[model samples]
Target: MGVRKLATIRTAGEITPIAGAEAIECCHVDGWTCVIKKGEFKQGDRGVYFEIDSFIKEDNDRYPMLSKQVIDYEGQRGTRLRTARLRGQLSQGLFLPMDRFPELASNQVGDDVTEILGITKWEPPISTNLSGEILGEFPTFISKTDQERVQNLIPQIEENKGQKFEVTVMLDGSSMTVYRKDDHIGVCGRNWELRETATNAQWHAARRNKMIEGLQFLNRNLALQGEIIGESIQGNLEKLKGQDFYLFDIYDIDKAQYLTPIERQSLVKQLNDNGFTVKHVPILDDLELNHTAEQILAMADGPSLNKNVKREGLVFKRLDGKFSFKAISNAYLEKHKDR
Candidate 1:
């Protein structure tokens, strides 16, 4: 769902001293802030920057300090880099010395070196319970669900200074898609299509939400994209009694594009007014892209629509549908051990 470069060439833009600290300093790498050991790197120095969530595989000789950060993935064990705070300063990712990779003598600041360095991302483990009765591969016509972090889109943010966007709450539920293509009903999870079974949570969601009846009433070839929340899903963060689907978007199968924010809201109201059960994700703000990435990230932290819990984060979707990105709450990530 996402394509992130775990390692890349980057310039250490600025280095500032941390108060009351003598052995370490803070290094500014574009939109991210990280603490580096004193004299390890200097301002304007070019090196390989491994972003947080990067997994350093076990038995790799180049990467040291692997004892405390050990984590395991689908039969692969390694060290995972996570956000850290030191001396009251927040540090994200690590700036490694690129002296060993002299082969990239002509590498530029934004060049990706993940493959050359053998670095991969660390992801939360998946359960076998949801891999139900396989119908087929993920439908080629529909788009996958994911968003790049706002930290990685700093340049894009600057380029889209005046663009208007609709900010929606990013829920922590499982990604669900229900489609009515050529009057044929089908369901899908995050990656693949599945056969409808009595116990399958995705099927339970489609049926529980009366999705088929509503989509049939509309008589259109499209997909209802949303999140599936329930007691057994994602720790039931929303504290729902039963399975439910909250429609975040509608993709026009005929046009092969997504409906605009206004159009989706109007359509949701149209359906609900006709006795259909459908809901849109919480819309938090309607504003122009006029702030720095750091400021936008600060805005991501706030109260959740549900009581007694902090929201997962915020999703910024441009009105023009050309671009979008996510801003995950550091507070949330600090508490969550999984990606």
Candidate 2:
């Protein structure tokens, strides 16, 4: 039903509205897909994806992308770059001009805007400090998602959607990215730079268990955004050995929303059917600000949740993808060794 051009290059599989292409054929290594709509890609269609990691390539000057650290452990190269692919959100100026295929101009419109844009760059929100440097919060900080300013109103947030949030398990693992184009497979950490070959164990484990089928499924769908936590990965979370990764965010293509209520229920069930264990966040019916914060702190640790290790707290999301915000309880971090 679909064929691709090459690693950096791709062909139109089918035609669709959001994707611009009916089908987006791509390799898990590159992990980049062209959203083609009826033989043409739209102005902003890198395929729908939800990424949890952050990176800042030298290329992005027009827009801001956050940078994260990469972890390297044993000899397996936990998250090193195996292939020679680009990083972040690469702009047209960063590569060969779209003029080569002027016919694709309609799909390749952002020439001037993305002069040095990296394909997967991370851009956080910027807030102005008293010093006036213009500070911003990264997507990583869920605190920016908070709405309730007081404890008395906490119950309102809980009941805001009635059932409007999909709380996926927040894993404790190192952020890893695997790029596979053709035969080359490159792995990277949060920094976006390619990792050296065979040095980190966790990265290596990720490479060893690199989910090609899953990535392809994501490529076909839109993107597989999730947390890769557990064991030695996320600061040895849950006190487990080794580690594991999960696709918490299974996004939709056309509409800017998550799976419907019925869809989410079915999807989680499907994931379990595939022999995968999914941790879920709690949805409180009525909440007090202090009580909600207390709940989070409880999850953090106190010889209650996990005993020795700290619970990283909860991750919040809007069920329909209509509403979203994050809340972090200081107590949660301070109690569990300030984790």
Candidate 3:
């Protein structure tokens, strides 16, 4: 699943000074870096860490800065939490004070109060071109590539320490999938099956790229997943002149698992050789998992590969495809607030 309400509580974490800021300090909750009022917390002080993308209800206007950013849902106003920079230091989420909701005092750290707190994930609007004609529901065989934000993986950070991971650019765009299983061929828009047509941008893009023929070459049941980006898509974050799809994963219908990086590389090369316009995501450095949350956040900050624009961030996956997570760039978020 993508972002969902969970009964998760927060924990106190190491506090560090911002490069140039004073008076305020930054704390890491799991993988999210949050700015807190100095002297308000200690190393072990515990509270609820509302992850980024969470919408905090504006019951008392506690988050004054979000007065204009707050969204309205069923007459309730809530602030949409997102990655931001405070005095040049990147902040990912907000620290929910225990005093705000005394009832949760009885709840332990890591307990979920998303629904109770009126916190929900923020979803972006979709364009009609990308909506497409619905054919049916998403097939259950293939897994969606919705990775958990690194900020929510505090336990895994320590457990996966020293484990090697392959990092790739986290492209900002609409999720697209093309698959062939048994005798049927289809394309999907993240969750819904879509009919192939010129009006449906994703379906048209796949058909233009000859994706079906490429899949037929393998002579095996499979599904290819990636992002469809370009002008008019996701505000054209990459500044692409035209629409394009970048392959990121190859799902094996028979094996019920994604192919390894090496296997994917071979398949991609074969597709390219056969005149398919498919391309995989840009690969960043391979690194050991024994990195602090802050260090990993720093690695995600960079310029886009195609243009000099600020990159969305980085996606890290275990080489074996068993686990995956993402670290988004605060700079990128701040620059794309209009999005």
Candidate 4:
């Protein structure tokens, strides 16, 4: 996936005061809401809005208030913004006045200002066992498994109301992809193909699952994508002591597309029935798209399949390989303090 624009020039929407608060009020920007100081902005004003998970250099004098959030990431030091509560109102983003940036006063409302502001999207550091000698860059032929968050697709969801979807649990683990192209076997971490080594967690999962054998058993040019979960991975959110891999997607290499939900499930069953067993992600239920974006995201706060804690989120996708979106659990994000 391309770099996400952590900061954008957007028009401020509704402004409402938080009860029992004097200086703070709630403001809306598109589908996201943030808490802001009263009288600093009014509805219809254009300014910079920074989404959660943005990291700005601590040396950048632009935000002295954010210095307290300084944290280390991937050997660099910066301030990371995350979901939080202030005055009983959920604050999901940061809004600022455009007075200091007079050159951008006439810019388009939806224009990206991330580069200009020197703000970058923050990602958790990959554990030591996850990074290894590279076999190659992530192949261009296969698509990376990134899904849009529900907040960014509210309008589209409303437009596509009443479509059928299958809800699957969003596991808290590192991404892993295994594929067989002709007779060659490739195992990939999220961004690059990794050399199969004793220390590499992703390749360890591939070997443990016999991914190459299973793909060869079917004798098709295909890919199996999933998560590698267990101890030392994402804090083992599922509370699983042993390492495991769970399949979530099946891709047809020759066709250059992902298999539909039903098609993937059937193929997974076939693989297991032939004694090439592999685990698939837990499926919660089916749904007819009718809930508001907020209500749909609220569903992400429920308990996970393992019953240890709340899930990371839920992924909703249709059988036709279209209409895909992820609803991240706000409660889970709040509970996770690493960021």
- Name the candidate that leads on lDDT: 4
The TM-score of predicted model 3 comes to: 0.88
lDDT of 2 by residue, 1-339 (tens): 011111122222222343232343222112122222132243333321212222223222322121122333332212211112123211111122234333344553212221222233232221111012111222221111122211222445556634445443344444443333334333334333234444454344444444444344334332223444555343555665554544444445334345543465565565456643543332333222233433533443323124464444445455555554344333343333313
Candidate 1: clashing pairs of residues: none
* C-alpha root-mean-square deviation, candidate 2: 19.6
Clashes of 2: 59
Which tens-of-lDDT digit does each residue in 91-184 have in candidate 3? 7777756766677879877678888776777667786559888998888887876877676777787799988888889899988989999888
- Tell me which of candidates 3 and 4 scores higher on TM-score: 4
| After superposition, candidate 1 runs with Cα above 4 Å error | 127-129
Model 1 per-residue lDDT tens digits across residues 1-339: 656798888889779999999989999887888888889898989888889888878755666656667666657778888877788798888887668577778778789998877888886654444567879887888888778888888789999999999999888888888888895878999888989887788887787667878888888988889988757677766777876788887888889888888888888888888878887778977879899888988988777657578878899888866578889888777667565
Instruction: Give the RMSD in angstroms, all C-alphas superposed, for model 3.
Output: 2.8
Model 2 residue 272 CA deviation (Å) reads 5.9
lDDT for each residue of candidate 4 in 139-249, tens digit (9 for 90 to 100): 887777788888777678898788888899999898888998887889998899889877888877877777778888889988899989888887888888778899888
Clashes of each: 0, 59, 8, 0
Task: Please say which candidate is ahead in lDDT: 1 or 4.
Answer: 4
Q: What is the lDDT of candidate 2?
A: 0.34
Q: Pick the candidate with the highest TM-score.
A: 4
Cα-based lDDT at residue 148, candidate 3 = 75
- For candidate 4, the 10 contiguous residues with the lowest summed lDDT are 56-65
The best-first sequence of candidates by lDDT reads 4, 1, 3, 2
What TM-score would each prediction reach against the true structure?
0.93, 0.39, 0.88, 0.94
